[PDB]
Amino acid sequence: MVERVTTLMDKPEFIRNIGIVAHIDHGKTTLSDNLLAGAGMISLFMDFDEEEQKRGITIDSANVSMVHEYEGKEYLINLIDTPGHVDFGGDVTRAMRAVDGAVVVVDAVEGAMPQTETVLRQALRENVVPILFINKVDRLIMELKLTPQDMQIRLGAVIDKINKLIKGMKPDSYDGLRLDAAVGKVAFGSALNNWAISVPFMKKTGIGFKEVIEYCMEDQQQKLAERCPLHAVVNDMVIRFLPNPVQAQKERIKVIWHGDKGSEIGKSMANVDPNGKVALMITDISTDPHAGEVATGRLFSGTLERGKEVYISGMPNPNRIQQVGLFMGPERIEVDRITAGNIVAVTGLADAIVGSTASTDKAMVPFESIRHVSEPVVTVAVEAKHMKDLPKLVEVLRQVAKEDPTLKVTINQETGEHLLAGMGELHLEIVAHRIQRDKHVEITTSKPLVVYRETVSAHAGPVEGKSPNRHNRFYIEIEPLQPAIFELVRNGEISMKQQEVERRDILMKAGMSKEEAKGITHISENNIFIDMTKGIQYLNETMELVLEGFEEVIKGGPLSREPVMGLKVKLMDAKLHEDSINRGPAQVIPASRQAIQAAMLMAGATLLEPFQKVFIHVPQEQMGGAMREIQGRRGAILDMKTEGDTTIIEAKAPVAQLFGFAGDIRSATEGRAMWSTEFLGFEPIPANMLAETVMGIRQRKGLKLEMPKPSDFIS
Ligand SMILES: Nc1nc2c(ncn2[C@@H]2O[C@H](COP(=O)(O)OP(=O)(O)CP(=O)(O)O)[C@@H](O)[C@H]2O)c(=O)[nH]1
Ligand SMILES: [Cl-]
Ligand SMILES: [Cl-]
Ligand SMILES: [Mg+2]
């Protein structure tokens, strides 16, 4: 529907910008593909990457446009199919920035799962409107053999669960967001077998759930697909209940744009005004063989045209648009111009990165950053196979990191090697593949290792740090953050920019003494610095330097130069030299670093390692094989439930223990165990493993091969 798409994209009221989101494997891509087939867009089309087809997983968000007719008018559905695996969660985040509505897909059998909540929360954070498609209802009918009422109960429990999540996330918006099957905001069906129903649709066609069960039970789901077409029921739901750009954009900018809402551009964004100045939110960078580098984004105001110039936020020179169009899976349909309200593919924006604001005016308030979180937990060292390829590798790693901001690329100064840090083993496997196959650089990679965290287990101090000229002294106590306070900081509930009586009240109503709440001076990662001193001359002008020493230590702790978390650092006393020449950065910053590092080692310094939480659905026949695999990897079982022939195992294990788990769990269960994973958190390494783990880390970093001591820091 090439000419259809183009005619429709000019009319913002008939557009739906949507994303398909779900727990891994609940059926996003089958849904998206069969929506496209039913709609006559195609005869898995969206998993068009080779590794996606090879591994049977969505790795990258894919974009496609779809024409659907509803009550005598055609609508343009700009759809994003997103990945389910936690390692690719940043693809979901970037996609939620670009869409206005979301089809939350949930497997009827497993029901809502941990990444179901994750994707729902990411949608609501962006003021994206959710509807619900309960998929795999064929399995629920054919494998559990439940009566209609049992199946009404099961489906209704899923709806209720999604609604509790919504109500917990957006309590004041709950009424308008609540999912109601009788209203039509929920459908149920089988993406695989091209059929779907909803309460209003069943009334309309005169078909009950008992007839639906018969269709499946008598091996006639093809007939059901004709009577109850998947694409009709779901696309209708999309048109009816997901919002157009005209309703939505004013809601999106409440949370993605902190500029003057009554400005010229705030109005033209709020009105989807094609004649306004360009306002284009860049959500993705990727490379194609013909278009070259391509920026994906959401156009809120203006019109994009080949040859038009836009400014990129933070960059001085104006970028020129070379081509504009829409993605159709692996293809990108080119068009003369695209108007506000659409999800666009643009070439020629050399300076754009994920999160960029493209605008006509250089002085436009930039859109809010695309939030990240989830710091890397797995790392690999990477090197060019042939030394003639070193500068290509430099340029290629820059490009890989630009296209995937969840990857962190640093350089080992003690080996000249590049380190790739990402979300998991699979994440790094794909990256190494996308450097060789796609970027044409032969590389060698080390085995994946985890990134640890350093912390303390007890209180210590006051410890005296002394400047190299011996003229300045700082007295530091250190101890663990209480869990309530750690959570406030990790969730961003407090801040030094925040108001001082407000922050003091949040901290104190969390357990912190008034002394320490009012003394809090700095936050850095999941650590705080408190000033407990009164009336020390020159400490005000010197405190900025003390905090720099604190920040440096947080970046890499004294045990193994791993990042530090969970620390409460307190300045109890200080002595500074009268003359500023004796108390500048070269004097104060080392004194601060050394006091803090010595206190840490005196406070039961130890390592935390990342843990994954693992969910396994396995038939009873293979339960024993599943159990042996997780228990053999020193994982702890957390709970176990039975639901018919299936055992549901909830377990945790160190990330470091779960490398190669996919292939081993398949072998031990003959491929019959479904499993998924999520980051749990950093937990203490075994107490009898601290010396060996620290030595292991220091050796592979090039650091000195000896256990650090507080005598290394304070003379
Ligand atoms: N029985 C049944 N199987 C389905 C249905 N929908 C999808 N599947 C199956 O589930 C598996 C995963 O399907 P897929 O569309 O790739 O799910 P996905 O959520 O996109 C996977 P990922 O999270 O990695 O992107 C496939 O074997 C697919 O055939 C359904 O309605 N019924
Ligand atoms: Cl605390
Ligand atoms: Cl002062
Ligand atoms: Mg998929």
Tell me, yes or no, whether 50 and 180 share the same domain. yes
Q: Tell me which residue has its CA closest to atom 29 in ligand 1.
A: 192
Nearest to 404 by CA among 384, 433, 383, 364: 433
Q: Measure the CA–CA gap between 619 and 137, rounded to whole angstroms.
A: 19
* 702: amino acid identity, one letter: G
Q: Could you tell me which residues are beta bridge partners of residue 420?
A: 380, 409
Q: Measure the CA–CA gap between 82 and 649, rounded to whole angstroms.
A: 26
**The tokens of 593 are what?**
């670093």
Classify the C-alpha dihedral 556-562-563-565 as positive or negative. Answer: negative
Residue 619 parent element (H or E): strand 606-619
Q: Measure the CA–CA gap between 180 and 177, rounded to whole angstroms.
A: 9
85 annotated as ligand-binding: yes
Give distance in angstroms: CA of 230 to centre of ligand 1.
15
Tell me, yes or no, whether 90 and 173 share the same domain. yes
- Cα angle vertex 191, ends 185, 197, to 5°? 40
Tell me, yes or no, whether 411 and 550 share the same domain. no
Q: Name the domain boundary from 430, 453, 476.
A: 453
Q: Measure the CA–CA gap between 675 and 682, rounded to whole angstroms.
A: 21
Classify the C-alpha dihedral 138-140-143-144 as positive or negative. Answer: negative
CA of residue 169 relative to chain centroid, distance? 17
Nearest to 138 by CA among 194, 201, 206: 194
Strands (E), 393-535: 408-411, 418-422, 443-445, 449-450, 453-455, 460-466, 473-480, 520-523, 528-531
**DSSP line for 116-159:** HHHHHHHHHHTTPEEEEEEE-HHHHHHHH---HHHHHHHHHHHH
Tell me, yes or no, whether 282 and 204 share the same domain. no
- Domain count of the fold of the chain: 4
Give distance in angstroms: CA of 57 to centre of ligand 4.
6
Q: Measure the CA–CA gap between 317 and 491, rounded to whole angstroms.
A: 37
Q: Could you tell me which residues are beta bridge partners of residue 163?
A: none
Q: Measure the CA–CA gap between 143 and 358, rounded to whole angstroms.
A: 51
Burial of 128 (0-12, 13-18, 19+ CB in 10 A): buried
Residue 191 alpha carbon, nearest atom of ligand 1: 31
Nearest ligand for residue 22 CA: 1
Question: Alpha-carbon Rg of the chain, whole angstroms?
Answer: 28
Question: Terminus-to-terminus CA distance in the chain, angstroms?
Answer: 76
Tell me, yes or no, whether 214 and 265 share the same domain. no
CA dihedral 284, 116, 483, 648 (to 10 degrees): -130
Full residue range of the structural domain in which residue 399 is found: 378-453
The number of residues making up the chain comes to 715
Tell me, yes or no, whether 96 and 161 share the same domain. yes
Tell me, yes or no, whether 256 and 219 share the same domain. no
Q: Tell me which residue has its CA closest to atom 24 in ligand 1.
A: 57
Q: Tell me which residue has its CA closest to atom 21 in ligand 1.
A: 25
CA dist list (Å): 320 to 38, 295, 305, 349: 38, 13, 10, 6
Q: Measure the CA–CA gap between 682 and 699, rounded to whole angstroms.
A: 22
Ligand 1 — pocket residues by CB below 6 A?
A: 22, 24-30, 57-58, 83-85, 135-136, 138-139, 190-192
Residue 57 alpha carbon, nearest atom of ligand 1: 24
Backbone angles phi, psi at 435, to 5 degrees: -90, -40
CA dist list (Å): 198 to 165, 185, 205, 294, 408: 22, 8, 11, 39, 45
Q: Are 653 and 4 in contact (CB under 8 A)?
A: no
**Resolution to 1 decimal, in Å?**
2.1
Q: Measure the CA–CA gap between 629 and 636, rounded to whole angstroms.
A: 11
Helices (H), 603-656: 623-632
Q: Measure the CA–CA gap between 265 and 368, rounded to whole angstroms.
A: 15
Nearest ligand for residue 482 CA: 2
361 annotated as ligand-binding: no
- Is the peptide bond preceding residue 619 cis, with omega within 30 degrees of 0? no
Q: Name the domain boundary from 208, 239, 270.
A: 239
Tell me, yes or no, whether 200 and 278 share the same domain. no
Q: Could you tell me which residues are beta bridge partners of residue 281?
A: 298, 357
Residue 303 lies in a domain: yes
Nearest to 242 by CA among 169, 200, 179, 165: 179
**The tokens of 3 are what?**
């000419």
Tell me, yes or no, whether 217 and 279 share the same domain. no
Residue 695 lies in a domain: no
Q: Could you tell me which residues are beta bridge partners of residue 57?
A: none
Ligand 2 is an ion; its neighbours by CB within 5 Å are 481-482, 485, 568
Q: Measure the CA–CA gap between 17 and 665, rounded to whole angstroms.
A: 38
Helix (H, G, I), strand (E, B) or coil at 532: coil
Give distance in angstroms: CA of 21 to centre of ligand 4.
9
